[PDB]
Write a protein that binds this DNA or RNA. Structure first.
Ligand SMILES: [Mg+2]
Ligand SMILES: [Mg+2]
Ligand SMILES: [Mg+2]
Ligand SMILES: [Mg+2]
Ligand SMILES: [Mg+2]
Ligand SMILES: [Mg+2]
Ligand SMILES: [Mg+2]
Ligand SMILES: [Mg+2]
Ligand SMILES: [Mg+2]
Ligand SMILES: [Mg+2]
Ligand SMILES: [Mg+2]
Ligand SMILES: [Mg+2]
Ligand SMILES: [Mg+2]
Ligand SMILES: [Mg+2]
Ligand SMILES: [Mg+2]
Ligand SMILES: [Mg+2]
Ligand SMILES: [Mg+2]
Ligand SMILES: [Mg+2]
Ligand SMILES: [Mg+2]
Ligand SMILES: [Mg+2]
Ligand SMILES: [Mg+2]
Ligand SMILES: [Mg+2]
Ligand SMILES: [Mg+2]
Ligand SMILES: [Zn+2]
Ligand SMILES: [Zn+2]
Lengths: 59, 136, 49, 79, 182
RNA sequence: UUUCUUGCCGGAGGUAGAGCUACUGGAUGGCCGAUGGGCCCCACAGGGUUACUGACGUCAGCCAAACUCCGAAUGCCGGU
RNA sequence: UUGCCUCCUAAAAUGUAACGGAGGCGCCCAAAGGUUCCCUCAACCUGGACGGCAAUCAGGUGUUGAGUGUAAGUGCACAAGGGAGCUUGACUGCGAGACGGACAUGUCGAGCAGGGACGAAAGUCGGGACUAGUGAUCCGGCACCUCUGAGUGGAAGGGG
């Protein structure tokens, strides 16, 4: 790893609105990333006709 | 007329009329063929003449192969020109034909009509030729 | 013209020791290289005259 | 009319100058060539124009090394 | 004395899952991930050379290491491209920071894709490496959306010691990649 | 006697010839089928068909002063 | 059309004519030179945001069909092809021995010394993969040198 050329890589904490936390590395110098959605509360990750319309009108 | 689409060298030394044909000496497509017995430059105009003679005789119901393609150019100088001033422009396209070479092949159901058709073609060619079969 | 003949002279003793060519558009600046100078008997800086 | 040709360069007299078994002095030119049709072998140098020349006296020996044709000098026994 | 989160999960759980699933004869045959390459093909740079610097800064923030600028190897008139023009930026991630990028990607970046309906499971190159493209760079929290001049997409390839697409798909699946079902 | 002649030994070669699924070009007939083209479903999309056209590939028969995977006889250089 | 370079004609050493068949040159490069170290194309198959036959990315097949500043030929994958670090040998004094050949020209060269470049070292380097990019002699210009200086010291002029 060449000394000066890279952006600094810092220990970061990621926190989510669903409360899920996990520690990782990141380029964010603040060392904290707040995020609205994650793998754990994305609906995709979790799994979350004309005749019928006719009968809603007239039955 | 048969002409090559392109040639790398448009002005060529004359083909050498020496030696017996080492390749294309047997009938490979039809059942009858014309085998050359003499050296000649066969031109594309002679090939056309001969092929049409075969077609006219059989009328229909046969297939004619031409085993020889006239890709060798022969030049000609303009008329009434003195010697020198560069080589002439290409004028004729010829095949270098050697004795033993099979020039034309024919498939036809009737042997009598087939042989007659090939004879009609031979009279169009500058050389002496005989009819040959696939058999030994 | 485009590649004129230039003479390299020794910076120390100013003897015109070498002649060579360069593209004056590719190298507008006076060419400066180290060459053996016979008078000085050592490699010296030489500069286009 | 006129031809656009009529041009040629001098013949460069290339080729093998010393054949197999010929005794040569050091420095003697062995082959004149354009590329490495022949490669330098033992006690044979290659000139900047790809001339092959002897680095030591001896007999010229042609041989193949890894397919490359090579010219070699073998030392001749002293009388 | 340390290990990236996803790497620990691989060594402790995913290896055993793959051995039970595919029944490899030798442990050296267990597929792992070799490297992740992130490529940005700024073809527009063949005229507007300022664009290269944006792609470089974005990749540096996204991956944590300086991109390498890739020169065009071949002139092509239709693209107005001259040989030697800087036309691409690439980053090769390996080891610990390849496991961290992957963990951030699977956990944070992919769920931030707009209208994300999962990735297609058919983007394997027959030898079980996976490639997929992104159209924008906003789904990375390391980039300030306040500061982007223009949407800059990229191609992300995960290369694997898997010998076939089925094994490579199983590995990425166990790695948490969100694949569609077809 | 270093010249020449004959026998033998050591050498380089690309002609004659030949060969080309060994290259660069030319080129005959099959087979196979990208590619356009017509037409039917009809939406311009995904497809099913046609006396068209034929890449690429493949089977067999070939051609070249400036083609060569090959390759003499002679000639030439040296030794004896 | 006239000089130079490459191929064929040219008959397997060399050489070989024609108003025979084809092209190129009267440069270019301060790196495209020197050295040390590393690397292997083109084409094709498969996958991938713009992106298509073809831009950049990834995997596979691929021994040479790519690339060698620039004609052609002989070469070069062992690379002479691609990349990178340092550098000026694109040297001064020389040169055993050869090629070529009417002559004048032209060409190759190990090795020795000086003072250097790169390299741990062995070593390589007297321009460029090689063969064109050029013009005799006379007359004259410029710089330098422990030469000469028309009675002598200078100087002019003349030498090297
Ligand atoms: Mg033959
Ligand atoms: Mg420069
Ligand atoms: Mg010549
Ligand atoms: Mg050289
Ligand atoms: Mg031989
Ligand atoms: Mg012949
Ligand atoms: Mg031949
Ligand atoms: Mg000869
Ligand atoms: Mg001869
Ligand atoms: Mg004569
Ligand atoms: Mg090189
Ligand atoms: Mg010079
Ligand atoms: Mg001499
Ligand atoms: Mg010369
Ligand atoms: Mg020295
Ligand atoms: Mg030397
Ligand atoms: Mg040179
Ligand atoms: Mg070079
Ligand atoms: Mg005079
Ligand atoms: Mg006086
Ligand atoms: Mg006086
Ligand atoms: Mg004076
Ligand atoms: Mg003088
Ligand atoms: Zn969450
Ligand atoms: Zn000096």
């Amino acid at each position: 790893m060449k000394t000066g050329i890279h952006p600094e890589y810092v220990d970061t904490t990621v926190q989510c609105g669903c409360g899920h936390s996990f520690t990782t590395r990141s380029t964010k110098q603040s060392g904290t990333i707040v995020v609205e959605v994650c793998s754990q509360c994305h609906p995709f990750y979790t799994g979350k006709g004309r005749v019928a319309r006719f009968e809603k009108r007239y039955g | 007329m048969l002409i090559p689409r392109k040639v790398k060298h448009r002005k060529q030394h004359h083909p050498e009329q020496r030696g017996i044909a080492s390749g294309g000496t047997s009938v490979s497509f039809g059942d009858y063929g014309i085998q050359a017995l003499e050296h000649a430059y066969i031109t594309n105009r002679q090939i056309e003449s001969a092929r049409i003679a075969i077609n006219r005789h059989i009328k229909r119901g046969g297939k004619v192969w031409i085993n020889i393609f006239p890709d060798r150019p022969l030049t000609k100088k303009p008329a009434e020109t003195r010697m020198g001033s560069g080589k002439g422009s290409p004028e004729w396209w010829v095949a270098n034909v050697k004795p033993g070479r099979v020039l034309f092949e024919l498939s036809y159901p009737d042997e009598k009509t087939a042989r007659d058709a090939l004879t009609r073609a031979i009279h169009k060619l500058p050389i002496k030729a005989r009819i040959v079969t696939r058999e030994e | 013209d485009v590649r004129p003949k230039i003479t390299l002279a020794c910076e120390v003793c100013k003897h015109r020791n070498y002649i060579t060519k360069k593209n004056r558009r590719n190298d507008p600046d006076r060419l400066e290289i180290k060459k053996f100078c016979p008078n000085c008997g050592t490699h010296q800086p030489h500069k286009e005259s | 009319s006129s031809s656009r040709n009529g041009r040629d360069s001098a013949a460069q007299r290339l080729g093998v100058k010393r054949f197999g078994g010929q005794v040569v002095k050091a420095g003697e030119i062995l082959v004149r060539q354009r590329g490495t049709h022949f490669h330098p072998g033992v006690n044979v140098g290659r000139g900047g124009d790809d001339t092959l020349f002897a680095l030591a006296p001896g007999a010229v020996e042609f041989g193949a090394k890894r397919g490359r044709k090579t010219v070699n000098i073998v030392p001749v026994a002293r009388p | 004395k340390a290990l990236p989160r996803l790497k620990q999960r691989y060594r402790e759980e995913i290896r055993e899952a793959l051995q039970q699933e595919f029944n490899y004869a030798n442990v050296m045959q267990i597929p792992g991930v070799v490297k992740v390459v992130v490529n940005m093909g700024v073809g527009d740079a063949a005229r507007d050379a300022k664009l290269i610097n944006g792609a470089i800064n974005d990749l540096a923030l996204i991956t944590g290491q300086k991109p390498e600028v890739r020169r065009a190897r071949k002139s092509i008139a239709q693209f107005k491209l001259r040989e030697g023009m800087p036309i691409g930026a690439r980053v090769t991630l390996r080891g610990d920071r390849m496991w961290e990028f992957l963990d951030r990607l699977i956990s944070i970046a992919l769920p931030r894709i707009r209208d994300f309906r999962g990735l297609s499971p058919k983007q394997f190159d027959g030898t079980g490496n996976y490639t997929f493209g992104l159209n924008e760079q906003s789904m990375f929290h390391e980039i300030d959306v306040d500061s982007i001049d223009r949407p800059r997409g990229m191609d992300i390839t995960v290369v694997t010691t898997a010998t076939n697409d089925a094994e490579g798909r199983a590995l990425l699946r166990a790695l948490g990649f969100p694949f569609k079902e077809n």
